[PDB]
Every structure is written in C-alpha cells, then in structure tokens.
From a paper:
BRD4 is a member of the Bromodomain and Extraterminal protein family, and has important roles in the expression regulation of oncogenes, as well as the maintenance of genome stability. As a tractable protein target with thousands of reported ligands, we have first screened the PhP library against the first bromodomain of BRD4 (BRD4-BD1). Maximizing the coverage of the experimentally validated set of binding pharmacophores at the fragment level, here we report a pharmacophore-optimized photoaffinity library (PhP) containing 100 fragments with diverse binding pharmacophores, equipped with a diazirine-type photoaffinity tag.
Intact MS screening against BRD4-BD1 has identified five fragment hits with >1% target labeling, and we could verify the binding sites of two of them by peptide mapping performed by LC-MS/MS following tryptic digestion. BRD4-BD1 was mostly preferred by PhP053 (6.7% vs. <2%). One hit, PhP053 was successfully co-crystallized with the protein, providing further evidence of binding in the primary (AcK) binding site. Other binding modes, including one in a secondary site for PhP053, as well as the AcK site and a third site (residues 156-163) for PhP072 were modeled with induced fit docking, considering the sites of labeling, as verified by peptide mapping. In the newly identified, surface-exposed sites, PhP053 binds via multiple H-bond and π-π contacts to the Y65 and K160 sidechains, while PhP072 occupies a neighboring site by multiple H-bonds towards K160 and E163. In addition, each of the two hits that were further verified by peptide mapping, PhP053 and PhP072, have labeled an alternative binding site in addition to the main one. We should highlight that the orthogonal, secondary binding assays (X-ray crystallography for BRD4-BD1, HSQC NMR for KRasG12D and MST for STAT5B-NTD) were carried out without irradiation, verifying the affinity of the fragments towards the respective targets via a non-covalent mechanism of action. For the highly tractable BRD4-BD1 target, both libraries provided fragment hits against its primary binding site (nine primary hits for PhABits and five for PhP).
Numbering used by the authors: 42 to 168
The structure:
C-alpha cells in the first residue's frame, strides 16, 4: 500500500510554452475547480496509506490530481492545452474507474467535471 512518487512537475529538457490557452487553464479552469467545496480530495495525489486504499495503485497506473496540475501550470510544464486537458480527464476517469456509481467521491468528481466542461467549452482561440 505504499504511495508512488508523484507525477513529474519538473523536467528541464521537456519542451514548454506559455500560451493564452494554458493561461486560461490556470486562471479560469484550475481556479474554478480549486475553490469548489468538493475540491479537497483532488488537491493532492491520492494517499493510499492515509485513505486505506491498498489496491489503489495496483489499479490506477496513470494517477493524476489537481495539485499536480496546479504545479504543472504554475511551473510552465506543458507544451499545449491538450496535455493539461488530458490531465484533468485522467483525474476524473481514475476516480470513476476505481469507485462505484453514487459513491460520494464520484458525486464530487462529477460536480467538478460539470464545471470543467463548461469552462473548456469557452477555451479561447489560440492567439
Ligand atoms: C470521500 C473519500 C472517502 C472514501 C474514499 O477514499 N474513496 C476512494 C477514493 N477515490 C479517490 N479518488 C480521488 C481522490 C480521493 C479518493 N478516494 N475521502 N475520499
């Protein structure tokens, strides 16, 4: 039931950019979800020890969370918006895969995902 090292948030040789779409992903998308009453389970990697989920990392092999995403955005880790959008979708999908319909954690993810979809719908044109 040990925890893996977190997903990478720093890699100097990896290519990155600062673009208007990525700026929107930080200023609008992340900020909106981060402040939500249901954000707290998703603000850091799943701690399988603390949450007593010893099978978690036997099932979820591409873990993702908003703490990781926040650091990726703030530390200019990404090349493009698609990469960051994929991280959010991974985070939601992991939750749905591991858990059961109507679990509280799933209801929480669904509420965050609703807002995510609304904001991604208005992702600005690349400048
Ligand atoms: C609501 C609950 C208690 C029950 C619980 O641990 N369920 C499993 C679980 N899946 C998760 N996916 C992402 C983040 C946290 C997660 N926890 N406190 N998390």
């Amino acid at each position: 039931s040990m925890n893996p090292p977190p997903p990478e948030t720093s890699n100097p040789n990896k290519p990155k950019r600062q673009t208007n779409q990525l700026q929107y992903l930080l200023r609008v998308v992340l900020k909106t979800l981060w402040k939500h009453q249901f954000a707290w389970p998703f603000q850091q990697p799943v701690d399988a020890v603390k949450l007593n989920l010893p099978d978690y990392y036997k099932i979820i092999k591409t873990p993702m969370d908003m703490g990781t995403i926040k650091k990726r955005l703030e530390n200019n880790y990404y090349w493009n918006a698609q990469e960051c959008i994929q991280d959010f979708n991974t985070m939601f999908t992991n939750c749905y895969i591991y858990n059961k319909p109507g679990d509280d954690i799933v209801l929480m993810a669904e509420a965050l995902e609703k807002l995510f979809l609304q904001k991604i719908n208005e992702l600005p044109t690349e400048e």
